[PDB]
Amino acid sequence: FKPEELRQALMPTLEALYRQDPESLPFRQPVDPQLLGIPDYFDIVKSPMDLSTIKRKLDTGQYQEPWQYVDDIWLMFNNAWLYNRKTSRVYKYCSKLSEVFEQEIDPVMQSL
Ligand SMILES: CO[C@H]1CC[C@H](n2c([C@@H]3CCCC(=O)N3c3ccc(F)c(F)c3)nc3cc(-c4c(C)noc4C)ccc32)CC1
Ligand code: NI
Ligand code: NI
Ligand code: NI
Ligand code: NI
Ligand code: NI
Ligand code: NI
């Protein structure tokens, strides 16, 4: 896997997430527990992940192969499904992003 060519295949699936409005809005920056006043967040969520961090990882070439990228995307989703209640807007928005992601990523993984 050449990093620039891998980035060209993976990045459209990240943009597809960012395009989701409002559903990507809680995911575009790292969760800020001090601003949101949720001091238990880093207790429950051991490994934070968000779209901005995944973008930087993609841009800088830290994904050697596509399943590490998939793994971080799902970590983002999984953190929010763990921390947030099923009835909450963030949780529902998370499920929406995951639905978009599976639609986007499956053709890309098969082409890779
Ligand atoms: C500047 O952009 C705004 C900042 C406030 C944000 N916000 C909000 C605000 C505050 C409360 C009321 C509300 O409805 N919010 C909100 C706002 C926009 C959304 F798209 C959304 F789904 C929820 N709640 C957030 C929750 C989380 C979160 C994630 C992801 N994982 O664990 C937690 C906790 C992250 C952000 C939240 C939503 C986007
Ligand atoms: Ni593009
Ligand atoms: Ni939408
Ligand atoms: Ni390499
Ligand atoms: Ni993982
Ligand atoms: Ni598409
Ligand atoms: Ni699938």
Author numbering: 1049 to 1160
Please share excerpts from the published article on this structure.
Many proteins, including the EP300/CBP histone acetyltransferases (HATs), contain several targetable domains. EP300 and CBP broadly regulate the activity of other proteins through their protein acetyltransferase catalytic activity. These proteins contain several highly homologous domains, including KIX, bromodomains (BRDs) and HAT domains, through which they interact with, dock to, and acetylate target proteins, respectively. EP300/CBP are critical gene-regulatory targets in cancer, with existing high potency inhibitors of either the catalytic HAT domain or protein-binding bromodomain (BRD). Using crystallography, we identify the binding mechanism of the EP300/CBP-specific BRD inhibitor CCS1477 in complex with the EP300, CBP and BRD4 BRDs, and define components of the CCS1477 catalytic binding core that are required for compound activity.
